[PDB]
Design an enzyme around this catalytic site. Structure first.
Site, PDB file in Angstrom:
ATOM      1  N   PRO A  37       0.894  -1.166   0.000  1.00 14.58           N
ATOM      2  CA  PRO A  37       0.000   0.000   0.000  1.00 14.58           C
ATOM      3  C   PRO A  37       0.931   1.214   0.000  1.00 14.58           C
ATOM      4  O   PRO A  37       1.585   1.475   1.007  1.00 14.58           O
ATOM      5  CB  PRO A  37      -0.750  -0.138   1.324  1.00 14.58           C
ATOM      6  CG  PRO A  37      -0.701  -1.612   1.601  1.00 14.58           C
ATOM      7  CD  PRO A  37       0.712  -1.967   1.221  1.00 14.58           C
ATOM      8  N   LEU A  88       7.179   8.629   3.825  1.00 12.13           N
ATOM      9  CA  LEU A  88       8.551   8.155   4.006  1.00 12.13           C
ATOM     10  C   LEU A  88       8.684   6.652   4.213  1.00 12.13           C
ATOM     11  O   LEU A  88       9.409   5.954   3.482  1.00 12.13           O
ATOM     12  CB  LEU A  88       9.188   8.895   5.186  1.00 12.13           C
ATOM     13  CG  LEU A  88      10.619   8.577   5.621  1.00 12.13           C
ATOM     14  CD1 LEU A  88      10.622   7.388   6.532  1.00 12.13           C
ATOM     15  CD2 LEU A  88      11.507   8.351   4.395  1.00 12.13           C
ATOM     16  N   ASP A  89       7.959   6.169   5.215  1.00 12.00           N
ATOM     17  CA  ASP A  89       7.970   4.773   5.625  1.00 12.00           C
ATOM     18  C   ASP A  89       7.461   3.779   4.592  1.00 12.00           C
ATOM     19  O   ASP A  89       8.149   2.815   4.256  1.00 12.00           O
ATOM     20  CB  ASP A  89       7.207   4.684   6.933  1.00 12.00           C
ATOM     21  CG  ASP A  89       7.583   5.824   7.865  1.00 12.00           C
ATOM     22  OD1 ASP A  89       8.767   5.903   8.269  1.00 12.00           O
ATOM     23  OD2 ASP A  89       6.715   6.662   8.177  1.00 12.00           O
ATOM     24  N   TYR A 144       3.514   0.612   8.230  1.00 12.53           N
ATOM     25  CA  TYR A 144       2.715   0.805   9.435  1.00 12.53           C
ATOM     26  C   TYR A 144       3.563   0.719  10.696  1.00 12.53           C
ATOM     27  O   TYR A 144       4.431  -0.146  10.807  1.00 12.53           O
ATOM     28  CB  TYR A 144       1.616  -0.256   9.481  1.00 12.53           C
ATOM     29  CG  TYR A 144       0.435   0.088  10.354  1.00 12.53           C
ATOM     30  CD1 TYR A 144       0.471  -0.112  11.740  1.00 12.53           C
ATOM     31  CD2 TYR A 144      -0.733   0.605   9.794  1.00 12.53           C
ATOM     32  CE1 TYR A 144      -0.637   0.197  12.542  1.00 12.53           C
ATOM     33  CE2 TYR A 144      -1.842   0.920  10.582  1.00 12.53           C
ATOM     34  CZ  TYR A 144      -1.791   0.711  11.948  1.00 12.53           C
ATOM     35  OH  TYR A 144      -2.906   0.988  12.708  1.00 12.53           O
ATOM     36  N   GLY A 145       3.335   1.637  11.630  1.00 10.24           N
ATOM     37  CA  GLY A 145       4.064   1.614  12.890  1.00 10.24           C
ATOM     38  C   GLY A 145       5.357   2.391  13.024  1.00 10.24           C
ATOM     39  O   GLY A 145       5.766   2.732  14.139  1.00 10.24           O
ATOM     40  N   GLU A 195      -5.540  -3.531  15.345  1.00 11.36           N
ATOM     41  CA  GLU A 195      -4.866  -2.950  14.182  1.00 11.36           C
ATOM     42  C   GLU A 195      -3.974  -4.003  13.550  1.00 11.36           C
ATOM     43  O   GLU A 195      -3.884  -4.101  12.339  1.00 11.36           O
ATOM     44  CB  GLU A 195      -3.951  -1.788  14.582  1.00 11.36           C
ATOM     45  CG  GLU A 195      -4.573  -0.688  15.369  1.00 11.36           C
ATOM     46  CD  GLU A 195      -3.533   0.200  16.024  1.00 11.36           C
ATOM     47  OE1 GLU A 195      -2.755   0.866  15.297  1.00 11.36           O
ATOM     48  OE2 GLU A 195      -3.489   0.229  17.276  1.00 11.36           O
ATOM     49  N   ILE A 222      -2.783   7.967   7.364  1.00 11.17           N
ATOM     50  CA  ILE A 222      -3.664   7.399   6.346  1.00 11.17           C
ATOM     51  C   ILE A 222      -5.047   8.030   6.356  1.00 11.17           C
ATOM     52  O   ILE A 222      -5.586   8.374   5.308  1.00 11.17           O
ATOM     53  CB  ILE A 222      -3.834   5.854   6.528  1.00 11.17           C
ATOM     54  CG1 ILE A 222      -4.828   5.311   5.498  1.00 11.17           C
ATOM     55  CG2 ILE A 222      -4.308   5.529   7.939  1.00 11.17           C
ATOM     56  CD1 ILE A 222      -4.950   3.793   5.488  1.00 11.17           C
TER      57      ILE A 222
HETATM   58  N1  APC Z   1      -3.041   6.736   0.497  1.00 11.40           N
HETATM   59  C1  APC Z   1      -2.587   5.631   0.769  1.00 11.40           C
HETATM   60  N2  APC Z   1      -2.356   4.596  -0.220  1.00 11.40           N
HETATM   61  C2  APC Z   1      -1.824   3.265   0.033  1.00 11.40           C
HETATM   62  N3  APC Z   1      -1.485   2.887   1.298  1.00 11.40           N
HETATM   63  C3  APC Z   1      -1.687   3.858   2.335  1.00 11.40           C
HETATM   64  C4  APC Z   1      -2.219   5.216   2.160  1.00 11.40           C
HETATM   65  N4  APC Z   1      -2.285   5.871   3.377  1.00 11.40           N
HETATM   66  C5  APC Z   1      -1.833   4.980   4.227  1.00 11.40           C
HETATM   67  N5  APC Z   1      -1.439   3.728   3.714  1.00 11.40           N
HETATM   68  C6  APC Z   1      -0.893   2.515   4.464  1.00 11.40           C
HETATM   69  O1  APC Z   1      -0.882   2.732   5.874  1.00 11.40           O
HETATM   70  C7  APC Z   1       0.323   2.922   6.524  1.00 11.40           C
HETATM   71  C8  APC Z   1       0.267   4.028   7.341  1.00 11.40           C
HETATM   72  O2  APC Z   1       0.952   5.035   7.478  1.00 11.40           O
HETATM   73  P1  APC Z   1       1.249   6.231   8.004  1.00 11.40           P
HETATM   74  O3  APC Z   1       1.506   6.267   9.534  1.00 11.40           O
HETATM   75  O4  APC Z   1       0.656   7.528   7.374  1.00 11.40           O
HETATM   76  C9  APC Z   1       2.584   6.044   7.143  1.00 11.40           C
HETATM   77  P2  APC Z   1       3.489   6.615   5.920  1.00 11.40           P
HETATM   78  O5  APC Z   1       3.147   5.937   4.623  1.00 11.40           O
HETATM   79  O6  APC Z   1       4.571   5.913   6.542  1.00 11.40           O
HETATM   80  O7  APC Z   1       3.950   8.076   5.720  1.00 11.40           O
HETATM   81  P3  APC Z   1       4.397   9.147   6.818  1.00 11.40           P
HETATM   82  O8  APC Z   1       5.186   8.574   8.001  1.00 11.40           O
HETATM   83  O9  APC Z   1       5.218  10.159   6.107  1.00 11.40           O
HETATM   84  O10 APC Z   1       3.034   9.752   7.353  1.00 11.40           O
HETATM   85  C10 APC Z   1       1.438   2.938   5.444  1.00 11.40           C
HETATM   86  O11 APC Z   1       2.643   2.300   5.656  1.00 11.40           O
HETATM   87  C11 APC Z   1       0.645   2.523   4.204  1.00 11.40           C
HETATM   88  O12 APC Z   1       1.063   1.194   3.819  1.00 11.40           O
HETATM   89 MG    MG Z   2       1.704   8.763   5.575  1.00 10.56          MG
END
Ligand code: APC
Ligand code: MG
Ligand code: SSC
Ligand code: MG
Ligand code: MG
Ligand code: MG
EC number: 6.3.3.6
Lengths: 500, 500, 500, 500
Positions: A243, A248-249, A344-345, A379, A445
């Site tokens: 996803p 960044l992550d 995630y995380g 979760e 997300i």
């Molecule tokens: N728009 C989107 N499309 C696909 N996957 C998404 C998404 N928003 C969230 N996710 C899934 O949910 C997880 C949640 O993440 P977040 O805590 O926002 C992480 P992020 O992707 O790491 O960016 P960030 O740390 O810069 O906010 C991600 O690792 C991602 O796999």
């Molecule tokens: Mg994000």
């Protein structure tokens, strides 16, 4: 299709009821029965103390094998149950806390007593429910399917959805007990046949003294623990789903995944209110993956929420809201991939949830609380992805990284108007991700897609009010577990009554 | 005037609230505070693992001393806590199940976590209540006095006042857990400060295979285990009180007491509806004791009920009813004695609750369930008698007798159109009691005095309906525990609202 | 005639070879053989972890059954093995140190690995010998009879007869190991088949702080513990034998025995001009017992020494010298009684070996030291008395009495120009013995009959030189254990060849 | 590394006597002293139960750190003591068997009781000697230097220089016990102060079933485990010394070492008779190492033998003879290198000791026995190389590699007409050594240099009679352990002066 349950003094009778609404296979035990869903994985092996059952999956066999291999060459060909059985007999139950995965290990002893060890992160939540008979399951709905609509007794919502911080053993089911993750439990019965659980924690609290780990070694450790999972998943699966949020992550995981898998499938979601497509597309292109975006409708956003509630049995509103996106991605990837990696995380380990530039008396404590909270929400349950034929994995949520970061010196998490500093340094050291991505400000997300707003609009409440959201989630939560709502024929349009 | 409590990480503050509604003193522990009611007994001892505390009293010190004396001479002058510490370190926690009495043993270790062991019969029921702070107490009301009227969450009466048989860990309080009697518990806290109880039973189920013990040895054991309790109390008291009913058991206890104490005070109660005064006077005359009889009005019968509820924290209808007579006896004996012996429970061990001449498939199993039921009712609590300056003892309720009788061949309990056959034969060999008493048909306390009928009259129900009686008892129970009703200003006349 | 041995992976030849010199029978075990002499006792019990064996006898079943009876009614009809198994599974191995007797408890686990527990006083010494095969026995002569004369290696007499104080694990056999009394031992084998004994003591050193136990409680305990061993013997045996010396202790046992048994047979012995008959006869008549004195000859005195060495496997000079008298008494009554009682060891508990009027800084330490010495000597072995059809018993040597006197206040053992002060006040209160006996100054067996002088004469040494007499006793010890001599064929030739 | 010892209740005299012969220091303990040579390594850590000491060195810290890091981030900076303490309190004593090194870990309990754990390979042998005082040391010569020539009592050369099969706990010293490697030992003292070692093995025999591990996985495992030891020595030590014989193993190490370090100094030895300089040189060229050969005269060879006996306390003829070559190599490298790698032991794991083309019913069993034999010899002792300022290392001798080869399928160790087949195939893939070397042929140290011939020529006996060679080794062994001979003052006369 992934969960299991066991009933003491149970027969085929109690099982047939479950199998009526859920497909899986039954199996007799010395003093009871074991039901495991269709897509459920399990292994067994004989021990001096009885037959050992391992239900679920292991994420770090490589590491466990390497450990057992120090004294037993048969560790290299051991199935999951035999592997953990080697560690159990040589290093005691405590050694099983070293294992990662959505598993549950238990020994069916001749005396009828059950010795069970729960995984230590929340990948496979296990409850012991007191119905007509005693039930141990990682899916509360199974018990209702077997004993009836009234099997489960729920607590008042005024008591339930109000606070946001709970113990990792908290459960809203009054006639039930949530087994503590990462502990040993012995299911005994007294002279009158009454059930009595004897539990013991397998891990004591880690120190909270700042870890002043030098920079170079730190980076080596981060590189090692983030790749370890991928190297395990490398052998099987030629293609892996991801996803992608352009964050960044999630982006860092794709980058690392490009060097471990032949083909990569990236998925993105957003609403009509907002999306992060611009950032994800940027990473997809830079890595040349099979990218594909999707704008979820209001009905889709809500359906995703209620699906995570049903499948992962989540009663917490924020958690259900956060899972919505992920659940729509699973639905979009169904049939395309069998394995998925996420980021995630990470924000809970490296300081992503901290406000850039702000001052924090004890940032690590703030973070630790969040790490802990994920233990009981759901979760991390894997059932959802499983029903979409997906083996969801979260590369950051490893024991080693979590422990490393637990008390890692704050200057690596928040410094010079930045956040996740050490992680950023490591990410661009890879020279695979664009600078704007590597240095993007954190965005959740439910935030980046405005899912929090779409949800608030349907409930008719402010985006901030998560107590009103929890009321709703807990409401459908009970409806699903009481069998008064079948996942098959359920739509957000028929839930107006649960709103007011 | 005998209960106690402990709070994890509590100051004198949390105690002041209690010491405001109750009398006693509060001592500080390593990571907490200990409150001990005015007339409550307790000893302390220094162990290597920390400071050991013994709250309550021991009934078989003489036996425990003789055990510890096998390897350590200091057992002969050890206080209660030091005595149990010797057993603990020498034979492990299981050895404490050999102790009898309304005690609670626990070790306060530097780490902050306490290791506690609960007595194994129900004399000192201990609960762990999760309020603003974790509380361990043998008196739930103390927690209410500490945090408020909303500290204890009570279950629905429809769910509570239904079933008759409950596990010995059952509790109507949702945010609390009743600690299993005769088990070791370690009260730990996880990385986030959340409380977690690690319990382990100290005794496993005995065998149910018929015990064909020859007549003579059996009679010797019965003579030995019934006298042991009296030989322990003989040196501590010159005068003893005895609720006498002219029955086989209380009369047998009086016969024995006459051979161990100087003066004997026998008391008898009844209603204008019925009484056993006749038979009671026979035994009093034969043994020439200071006998006293009292007729109870409905107000006193009801008052005895709501008092047993308040003091022994009883919510069961049948138990509160049975305790009524006894609580009225205590009031009659107040200031006259400091110790009392009863024949309570004998019918659960020797066949008394069995129907003469009737055929039974498994009599012992029937008796066993009853014995077990006493573990959770509160009927064996000692607070009530204690508040009347009385140390209540039930000679038949010893580990040795209960175990001996557990699987004792049924032909000793029911044979030739008689019941309690072996016991009657024993009481006969004493040549101290009249034959009409030794062979009198059994009749309960609440029956022979028609207290059951009187209780029914006020609730406007049928004698047999103990479901409606429990509703009333649980009702006042809740009122008393929430602190909504005070024992100082409560009369059966102002509780008409709880009847409807 | 009541010894036993166990050999790991032994063959039928081993057994047959043994049966060539000793009558009995071999019982095959999991992975080896178990041999027991014609007149040896042993019981068995099936356990979860294997088969439990109890060889020997138990002296305090009443006390043990009272312990187990607290939780298991079947304890009243359990054989010795079942009884020890109950204590073992309920209170751990440590509980077995609570039993008294010349027994050995071991569990035969299918894996060939047996777990053994030794009695805690030396009543039944047990060694682990490493010959061609690994053996475990309470008789070193059996290994010889099985593997040959060159099986047992002995250490130089220059190193054996030198020091006087040794550890309770001391053995002059270089290829053997004396299992510490009162300990649990796991006999295992490593990956290459080599023997490795994993031992763990079941007791901890008792406190040495003076015990200021008051006079009344002290006398009550003396009466209890001294009469208890007689109570457990009253049932069986209508007639008991008592080696009577006229000494305070032996006489106290005769008086007490006269109020427990039906017929008492007292036996006294003495040499030339040196005898205590005058005092023994006084008691015989003062208690009207079947008395019979016999004057021992030169040869008879010396023979009693070689016999105690053969049967009890004694190699200690003083020990053999002292045992000489008792071995003559056993022969004097080889068919008149089946059970004998003695006042042996009493002086080590009450101060008899102390010099009246003398001043000591730590008399108890001096006494405890001697109490410990009796563990390795072989004085308390039952073999000898057994081969004479007698069940040798020492009422004073009970865990309770020993533990009581351990640190008992010195003023009770030595005071105002007297010794054993409290013991004498006790005998006196019995109004059963003549004053001249209750206050008769201590006089050892070997001293009162000048045996210590006779032994010295045949060796041409001094009465005080036990280092020389031990060299002799060690000479025959080796001879007998190598089978080079016969207890029945001890010609004068070989005798002189042993003198030097 | 450099010898150490502990003396219970020791005095300053003992210590000063030791410093008289061996330079070092003594740190006081709870109830005794602890001595350590100038080059001895040791670290401490304060534990709850006492003070932990880690004397020696750890070879697999990174692996142990990777284990503890799973739950405690503080493991990344913990010293050796702290690290073992982390594993001890979380996974128990058994966990310390997972560590490799010439170490000894022990905990000084405040009461004087000492809990000690020995390494599981024989890298640092530990004895408990019972002289005037009780000692525990990894060098028997220390207790002598403190008690006198008559400290250690040796057994007759008749029962020593004969048998070839010994238990890993075997010692020629009668008054000394050899603590089994890989076990936890608790040095207790009973009520009378006598010593008592309660030991328990920390490991169990690994299965002997054939391991049918496929080719590719096995190769990766050989690669990983052979390189792991080198990755641990890469950081420090810029240069490394490698005794290169030209054989397959030492050459393979030199090869793998070249891909890790910066500069490799290869050394080779031999005699007038013959040598392997030819093959040894080819490897020196292919790798371009800093290779210098050196021929050994009649002496030097015989000197390396007496040296191994003094430093490694080796008393086995064959053992001494083999170490003779290594010691001469140290002297040739002293000052040039601080760490050395060898291919020692490889033949016992891959079958290099087996006769090519021959048929064996159970080749792994023969190999296993040899592997085991090295546990009591002193071969892996590090004391020798230590004095030469050299950290001797044997890459093949790792717990994992050993455990892997234990039951590895024979077709990998000896097939058709070859031996060490899989090892040879592995070295081949490296593409760093010439064919004639990779597929050389088993050739021992004492063999490839005719060292066994020279040693034999000095004894006159043949090169096969190792009983006379052991006769010599055992004699000097005792001489040295009594101080009757000096490492430096080795008169060429005293050789013969040994009745030899
Ligand atoms: N728009 C989107 N499309 C696909 N996957 C998404 C998404 N928003 C969230 N996710 C899934 O949910 C997880 C949640 O993440 P977040 O805590 O926002 C992480 P992020 O992707 O790491 O960016 P960030 O740390 O810069 O906010 C991600 O690792 C991602 O796999
Ligand atoms: Mg994000
Ligand atoms: O039996 C022995 O002493 C050992 C063998 C001889 C060669 C040596 C090695 O494999 O490097 N182990
Ligand atoms: Mg009655
Ligand atoms: Mg005498
Ligand atoms: Mg070679």
């Amino acid at each position: 299709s992934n969960s299991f349950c066991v009933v003491y003094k149970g027969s085929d009778t109690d099982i047939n009821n479950i199998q009526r609404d859920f497909d899986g296979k039954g199996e007799a035990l010395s003093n009871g029965y074991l039901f495991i869903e269709q897509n459920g994985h399990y292994q067994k092996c004989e021990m001096e103390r009885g037959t050992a059952y391992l239900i679920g999956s292991l994420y770090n066999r490589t590491f466990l094998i390497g450990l057992a291999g120090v004294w037993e060459g048969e560790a290299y060909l051991a199935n999951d149950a035999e592997l953990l059985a080697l560690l159990f007999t040589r290093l005691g139950a405590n050694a099983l806390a070293l294992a990662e995965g959505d598993f549950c290990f238990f020994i069916d002893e001749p005396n009828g007593e059950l010795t069970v060890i729960t995984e230590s992160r929340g990948f496979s939540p296990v409850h012991v429910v007191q119905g007509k008979k005693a039930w141990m399951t990682n899916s509360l709905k199974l018990v209702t399917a077997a004993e009836g609509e009234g099997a489960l007794w729920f607590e008042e919502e005024a008591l339930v959805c109000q606070s946001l911080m709970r113990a990792d053993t908290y459960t809203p089911v009054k006639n039930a007990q949530r087994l503590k993750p990462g502990a040993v439990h012995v299911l005994t019965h007294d002279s009158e046949g009454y059930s009595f659980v004897e539990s013991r924690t397998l891990t004591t609290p880690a120190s909270n003294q700042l870890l002043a780990l030098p920079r170079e070694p730190l980076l080596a450790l981060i590189d090692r623990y983030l790749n370890a999972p991928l190297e395990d998943l490398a052998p099987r699966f030629d293609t892996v789903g991801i996803p992608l949020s352009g964050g960044l992550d999630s982006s860092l995981v794709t980058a690392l995944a490009s060097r471990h898998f032949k083909k990569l499938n990236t998925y993105s979601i957003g609403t009509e209110l907002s999306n992060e497509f611009e950032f994800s597309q940027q990473v997809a292109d830079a890595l040349g993956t099979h990218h594909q975006m999707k704008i979820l409708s209001e009905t889709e956003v809500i359906n995703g929420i209620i699906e995570s509630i049903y499948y992962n049995e989540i009663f917490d509103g924020l958690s259900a809201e956060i899972q919505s996106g992920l659940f729509n991605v699973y639905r979009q990837a169904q049939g395309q991939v069998s394995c998925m990696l996420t980021g995630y995380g990470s924000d809970l380990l490296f300081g992503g949830i901290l406000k850039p530039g702000a001052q924090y008396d004890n940032p690590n404590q703030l973070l630790a609380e969040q790490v802990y909270r994920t233990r009981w929400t759901g979760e991390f349950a894997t059932h959802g992805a499983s029903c979409y034929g997906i083996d969801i994995r979260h590369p950051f949520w490893s024991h080693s990284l979590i422990s490393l970061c637990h008390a890692l010196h704050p200057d690596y998490k928040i410094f010079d108007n930045e956040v996740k500093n050490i992680l950023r340094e490591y990410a661009d050291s890879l020279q695979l991700l664009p600078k704007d991505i590597v240095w993007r400000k954190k965005i959740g997300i439910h935030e980046g897609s405005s899912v929090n707003q779409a949800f608030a609009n349907v409930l008719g409440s402010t985006v901030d009010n998560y107590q009103t959201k929890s009321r709703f989630t807990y409401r459908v939560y009970q409806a699903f577990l009481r069998g008064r709502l079948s996942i098959t024929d359920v739509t957000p349009s028929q839930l107006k009554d649960l709103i007011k």
